[PDB]
Design a protein around this nucleic acid. Structure first.
Ligand code: NA
Length: 199
DNA sequence: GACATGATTGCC
DNA sequence: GCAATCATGTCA
């Protein structure tokens, strides 16, 4: 609470926000009062209407993705492949948000392991957008919550960034190629390294 | 109402 | 290399 990043932090455009997320710690307070912690090491920016890789492309706006259009810091959690969740945080700009792709586990590792068992090496706990949601017990109920004012989840300030193309956007179009994915260089917790982009 | 599909994960 | 599994986006 005293460390929780507030409203002013989130009110930034997608790219600066996605880059600013690196190093920050995502915290999840479970019912047993225990708190799980993960330092963000990989994120992706979705610019909005012009961004053909975003759900909000062409100004598309529905009840499912309303979060992207809500105040910065508002969560947009959705179900993919009818089996996994993806956690995004609305940024400045309607239809713009930041997807979280990987965290470096810091605390509550044992609970995460249990959560993701449905023996896992720590490297398999949060190395992915859906894995991290599973590891932190994030689900559809976290959709549209305010990361700056929620009792169960918040971001804390943390004490070389690689910019690469996003994952699972395809190999067609200028937007699929744009370097809108950012992660901690040399980090062993990133979900997908891009040796090419690192050079 | 119907029908194609996914910013993944993980086993063959 | 590809199946799992179903809410959502579209078209009607
Ligand atoms: Na937004």
């Amino acid at each position: 609470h005293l460390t929780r990043l507030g409203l002013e932090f989130f009110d930034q455009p997608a790219v600066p926000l996605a880059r600013a997320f690196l190093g920050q710690v995502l915290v999840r307070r479970l019912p047993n009062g225990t708190e799980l912690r993960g330092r963000i090491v990989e994120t992706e920016a979705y610019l909005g209407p012009e961004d053909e890789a975003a759900h909000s492309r062409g100004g598309r706006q529905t009840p499912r993705n309303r979060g992207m259009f809500m105040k910065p810091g508002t969560l947009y959690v959705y179900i993919i492949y009818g089996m996994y969740f993806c956690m995004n945080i609305s940024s400045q700009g309607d239809g713009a948000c930041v997807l979280l792709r990987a965290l470096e586990p810091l605390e509550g590792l044992e609970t995460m392991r249990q959560l993701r068992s449905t023996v896992l090496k720590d490297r398999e706990l949060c190395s992915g957008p859906s894995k991290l949601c599973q590891a932190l017990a994030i689900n559809k109920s976290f959709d549209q919550r305010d990361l700056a004012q929620d009792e169960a989840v918040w971001l804390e300030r943390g004490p070389a960034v690689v910019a690469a193309a996003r994952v699972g956007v395809g190999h067609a179009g200028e937007w699929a190629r744009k370097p809108l994915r950012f992660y901690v260089r040399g980090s062993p917790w990133v979900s997908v390294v891009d040796r090419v982009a690192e050079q």
